[PDB]
Design a protein around this ligand. Structure first.
Ligand SMILES: NC(=O)[C@H]1CCC(=O)N(Cc2cccc3cc[nH]c23)C1
Ligand SMILES: [Zn+2]
Length: 139
């Protein structure tokens, strides 16, 4: 589980979005596994605007934060799940680290702020949905 709160927006994994998220839909992309909904309260998270390839993510299946090296956003083949058939997910960053499905939503942070959220895993790998290119989150 996990969301990002910047301004009047809430960023969640599209596969974990609620009825409230869908009834206040701002933008969704199934190929990126992202969904953005609108909020009444004002969020304080800082979105990183950078090309950083090192950061720290939160892993709820271990209650720990882990430092990682991750790839630049790209089209990666992702195995079938109960939410999506086997497809290519775009804007995906891979890292060597522990991940379990319930870890989706855990934030990846660098020295400039929030980079993205946990979205894929398996085989000792962890994949993150990049949010740094969504400049409209600060406006
Ligand atoms: N973005 C996607 O396609 C998601 C859809 C829902 C989902 O459970 N997964 C599989 C998955 C995610 C995170 C961690 C692990 C570990 C094993 N399987 C994992 C992928
Ligand atoms: Zn950075």
């Amino acid at each position: 589980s996990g969301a990002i709160y910047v301004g009047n927006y809430r960023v969640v994994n599209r596969h974990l979005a609620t009825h409230n998220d869908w009834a206040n839909l701002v933008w969704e992309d199934s190929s990126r596994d992202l969904l953005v909904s609108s909020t009444t309260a004002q969020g304080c998270d800082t979105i990183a605007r950078c090309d950083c390839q090192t950061g720290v993510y939160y892993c709820s299946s271990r209650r720990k934060h882990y430092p990682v090296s991750f790839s630049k956003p790209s089209l990666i083949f992702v195995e079938a799940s109960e939410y999506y058939p086997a497809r290519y997910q775009s804007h995906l960053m891979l890292a060597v680290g522990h991940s379990e499905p319930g870890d989706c939503g855990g934030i990846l942070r660098c020295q400039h702020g929030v980079v993205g959220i946990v979205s894929t895993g398996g085989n000792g790998l962890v994949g993150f949905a990049d949010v740094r290119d969504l400049l409209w989150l600060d406006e």
